[PDB]
Amino acid sequence: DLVNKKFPAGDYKFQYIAISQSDADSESCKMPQTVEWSKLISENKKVIITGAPAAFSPTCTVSHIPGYINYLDELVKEKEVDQVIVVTVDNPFANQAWAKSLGVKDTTHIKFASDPGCAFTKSIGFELAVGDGVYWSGRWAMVVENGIVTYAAKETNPGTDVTVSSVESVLAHL
Amino acid sequence: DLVNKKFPAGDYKFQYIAISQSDADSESCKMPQTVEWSKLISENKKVIITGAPAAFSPTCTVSHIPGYINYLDELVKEKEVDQVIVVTVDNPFANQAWAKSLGVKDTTHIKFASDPGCAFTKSIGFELAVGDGVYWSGRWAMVVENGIVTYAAKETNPGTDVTVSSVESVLAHL
């Protein structure tokens, strides 16, 4: 378990695609950006990551994620949170589109990260096995302060559950 | 190469989620279904399969897929064609959703199939390498008649090009 040890950034990366009003005002059709995990973390005092099995799946779309979009405001401003990252292993175009259908207008404090082939997610033991060796993210949530993991929980039944991974539970540790 | 041999179904299976008119009169809110490639082909006299790299990505979404939906009707009523399968490595929920966004109303003759971990597309050699072990599908088309590949082609620059994989080419070879 990763609680209160260093954040194991390694050299892992992710890709999200920007979403903005101000840009919307200024036309750009977005291609994926690449962030180093190590870079994000050592550039922001306070980060929330949560993992989701599959973009557009009922559990993640109705029951898990919308929560974080709602509390985004309380998170950034009251709890001093810096970045909230949503993680799936789904392509960053499908993650951007998913982020949109959910109501996200601005990616400055919220980002929908790909973890290509679950590399990162596996390396912390928070993946979900789906068969013939294919790996999705689990449903989980993680809090990093100062470069230290202060919170990290995995759902036992991600398919259906959203509990230890829920923005509420997260807030409780904030 | 794959043309003129028997369809290399082996024992691979894909997943999809249904869309329907009769079940709007019935409001069933579906999960994925499994289909053995082999059975699909055995059950069917004429199958168009096309593979695309990334769900909701610009070439896939704009230049490529619409064609196959555009001409869904002539393929079926003037070209004897039983099924048209769109293949990605994306999740069935992200696929069904992409489908609906392209304006699909029923899965009777079109199906957005997931080939998880690129397993099937790797086995035929139509994969696209994207790094760190990760593979997306390439941009490809293929026709299979009475259990045999009459047509199989792959784009060289799938990121940009909609040619040999176009529904125009498929149509020309039917």
UniProtKB/Swiss-Prot annotation, chains A, B:
InterPro entries: PRX5-like, Redoxin, Thioredoxin-like_sf, Thioredoxin_domain. One of its GO terms (biological process) is response to metal ion. There is a cross-link at residues 46, 79, 111 (Glycyl lysine isopeptide (Lys-Gly) (interchain with G-Cter in ubiquitin)). Changing residue 30 to R: Prevents urmylation of AHP1. Conjugated to URM1, a ubiquitin-like protein, in response to oxidative stresses. The attachment of URM1 to lysine residues exclusively depends on the presence of a peroxidatic cysteine in the target protein, with low specificity for the particular residue, motif, or structural context at which urmylation can occur. The URM1-conjugation reaction is mechanistically and directly coupled to the process of cysteine persulfidation, transfering the sulfur atom of the URM1 thiocarboxyl group to redox-active cysteine residues in the target protein if it is exposed to oxidative conditions. Persulfidated on specific redox-active cysteine residues. Persulfidation (also called protein S-sulfhydration) may provide a molecular mechanism that enables cells to protect vulnerable cysteine residues from reactive oxygen species (ROS) under stress conditions. GO terms for cellular component: cytoplasm; cytosol; mitochondrion; peroxisome; plasma membrane. Residues 7-174 form the Thioredoxin domain. The keyword Oxidoreductase applies. Pfam families: Redoxin. The modification Cysteine persulfide is found at residues 60, 118. It catalyses: a hydroperoxide + [thioredoxin]-dithiol = an alcohol + [thioredoxin]-disulfide + H2O. Induction: By H(2)O(2). Keywords: Acetylation, Antioxidant, Cytoplasm, Disulfide bond, Isopeptide bond, Oxidoreductase, Peroxidase, Phosphoprotein, Redox-active center, Ubl conjugation. The active site is at 60 (cysteine sulfenic acid (-soh) intermediate). Signal peptide: none annotated. The active site is a conserved redox-active cysteine residue, the peroxidatic cysteine (C(P)), which makes the nucleophilic attack on the peroxide substrate. The peroxide oxidizes the C(P)-SH to cysteine sulfenic acid (C(P)-SOH), which then reacts with another cysteine residue, the resolving cysteine (C(R)), to form a disulfide bridge. The disulfide is subsequently reduced by an appropriate electron donor to complete the catalytic cycle. In this typical 2-Cys Prx, C(R) is provided by the other dimeric subunit to form an intersubunit disulfide. Present with 16228 molecules/cell in log phase SD medium. Thiol-specific peroxidase that catalyzes the reduction of hydrogen peroxide and organic hydroperoxides to water and alcohols, respectively. Plays a role in cell protection against oxidative stress by detoxifying peroxides and as sensor of hydrogen peroxide-mediated signaling events. Preferentially eliminates organic peroxides rather than hydrogen peroxide. Relays alkyl hydroperoxides as a signal to the transcription factor CAD1/YAP2 by inducing the formation of intramolecular disulfide bonds in CAD1, which causes its nuclear accumulation and activation. Involved in cellular Mn(2+) homeostasis. Homodimer; disulfide-linked, upon oxidation. This is Peroxiredoxin AHP1. It comes from Saccharomyces cerevisiae (strain ATCC 204508 / S288c) (Baker's yeast). The lineage of its organism: Eukaryota, Fungi, Dikarya, Ascomycota, Saccharomycotina. The gene is AHP1.
